[PDB]
């Protein structure tokens, strides 16, 4: 859902629903953490400094900033996908007539030659 | 009538021109900065115009902080006019 109906408008993270549990040491977090390290490699390409890998130790600021913002950004990702599924399952339960079930068949299909 | 009152003054004013007309037979761009500041101040005056006619039903404590606020910024605009305006 795009427009809020049950969720509170303008939230820092969620706060209305907190129970979901965020991912711990996820493969998704590692890629954002890799980009934080990658940003601390190409910064020495702009301002000409000796060695991209073994240069200035202000790289720790670049890794942490990508992790801290990324953790909050992925927390919203797990939240928004949950709400999207929650409203989907509630739509089937309340209406029932919109959904139809079919199982087990013996229907003929056209066979291809050559 | 307001329409009858206004038109009588103009029609008598036009008649005085014809008397003299028919009867006898035989650069610097520094001025612009003054003109602009007139317009920008008068709009702050336009916002400060309702004060004697507005303050009758509304709460005074909510208005007091907001009424002075426009005049303060009207002085800040004049404070920017002190940091070299020119020879004018």
């Amino acid at each position: 859902x795009x427009x809020x109906x049950x969720x509170x408008x303008x939230x820092x993270x969620x706060x209305x629903x907190x129970x979901x549990x965020x991912x711990x040491x996820x493969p998704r977090l590692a890629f954002v953490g890799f980009l934080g390290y990658c940003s601390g490699l190409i910064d020495n390409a702009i301002r000409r400094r000796p060695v991209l890998l073994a240069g200035l130790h202000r790289q720790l600021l670049y890794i942490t900033s990508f992790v801290f913002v990324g953790y909050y950004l992925l927390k919203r990702q797990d939240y928004m996908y949950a709400v999207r599924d929650h409203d989907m399952f509630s739509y089937i339960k309340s209406h029932x007539x919109x959904x139809x079930x079919x199982x087990x068949x013996x229907x003929x299909x056209x066979x291809x030659x050559x | 009538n307001l329409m009858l009152a206004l038109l009588t003054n103009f029609t008598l004013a036009t008649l005085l021109v014809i008397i003299a007309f028919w009867l006898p037979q035989l650069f610097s761009m520094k001025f612009f900065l003054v003109a602009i500041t007139f317009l920008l101040f008068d709009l702050e005056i336009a916002l400060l115009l309702p004060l004697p006619w507005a303050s009758q039903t509304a709460n005074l404590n909510t208005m007091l902080t907001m009424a002075l606020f426009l005049i303060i910024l009207l002085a800040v605009s004049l404070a920017y006019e002190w940091t070299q305006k020119g020879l004018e």
Partner: protein, 296 residues
């Protein structure tokens, strides 16, 4: 509706008979005798100036651009005479829903009278001096709006009839002591030729001197009053005219006594010096009805 003609014809006579006052009262200031030969005390001269300029005096225009030059005196005389309508007096002719807003509006449109005259001349020589004359009027209209509001915020709405009723025991000169000093100076900016100076040319005299009486009357409403008396219209009519005449003497006082302030230093008296002073008093006049109960 006959009263409109009883507020143009005696008013045009008042602008005419000013020529006596403007050089006899000004005369005794300069120890010279004014009008004396023409009439018994020179009373025949004001009407004699009308016969001289209107009928016999011909025209020699610089270019005459179709509609203009023969349109600027209509705007000059028309706006000066329409200012008499919203005036409270003992009783006003067709009283407006809001009084002083009509007064400030027709004075701000009276700037055009000196604007179209600058466009009438084809030469660049005249228009630079013409725009300088606009600057004398346009700048002082900023403060004129501020000092008006401070008097209104003390007591009464925009209606001019309510301004007479609020002055029952004491004048508004005493509570508005620095503001009353401002109206003596700010009014002189509108082509009075006392702090600064720049056929159809004769018609401008009939319009410019008309505004002088207009500012004298308008100061005698905002600051003077003494008594109202609705039952007796006789007592108010005589007492109002004497108060206005005393302010007319002060208008001719500045013209004789004091030299011109320079155009550059006119923008040092105002803007640099007056605008911080007027707004500080405006700040004071916002707090006054809140500090002590004073709402119409």
């Amino acid at each position: 509706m006959i009263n409109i003609l009883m507020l143009i014809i005696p008013i045009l006579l008042a602008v005419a008979f000013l020529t006596l006052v403007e050089r006899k009262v000004l005369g005794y200031m300069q120890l010279r005798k004014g009008p004396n030969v023409v009439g018994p005390y020179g009373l025949l001269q004001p009407i004699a100036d009308a016969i001289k300029l209107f009928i016999k005096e011909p025209l020699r225009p610089a270019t005459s651009s179709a509609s203009m030059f023969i349109l600027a005196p209509i705007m000059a005389l028309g706006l000066a005479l329409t200012m008499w309508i919203p005036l409270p007096m003992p009783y006003p002719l067709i009283n407006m829903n809001l009084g002083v807003l009509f007064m400030l509006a027709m004075s701000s449109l009276a700037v055009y009278s000196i604007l179209w005259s600058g466009w009438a001349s084809n030469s660049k020589y005249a228009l630079i001096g013409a725009l300088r004359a606009v600057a004398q009027t346009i700048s002082y209209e900023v403060t004129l709006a501020i000092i008006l509001l401070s008097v209104l915020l003390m007591s009464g709405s925009f209606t001019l009839s309510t301004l007479i009723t609020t002055q029952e025991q004491m004048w508004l000169i005493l509570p508005a002591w620095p503001l009353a000093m401002m109206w003596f100076i700010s009014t002189l900016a509108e082509t009075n030729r006392a702090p600064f100076d720049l056929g159809p040319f004769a018609l401008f005299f009939m319009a410019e001197y008309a505004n002088i009486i207009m500012m004298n009357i308008f100061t005698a409403i905002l600051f003077l009053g003494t008594s109202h008396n609705p039952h007796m219209p006789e007592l108010y009519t005589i007492n109002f005219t004497i108060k206005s005449l005393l302010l007319t003497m002060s208008f001719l006082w500045i013209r004789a006594s004091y030299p011109r302030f320079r155009y550059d230093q006119l923008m040092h008296l105002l803007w640099k010096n007056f605008l911080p002073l007027t707004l500080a008093l405006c700040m004071w006049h916002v707090s006054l009805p809140i500090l002590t109960s004073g709402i119409p």
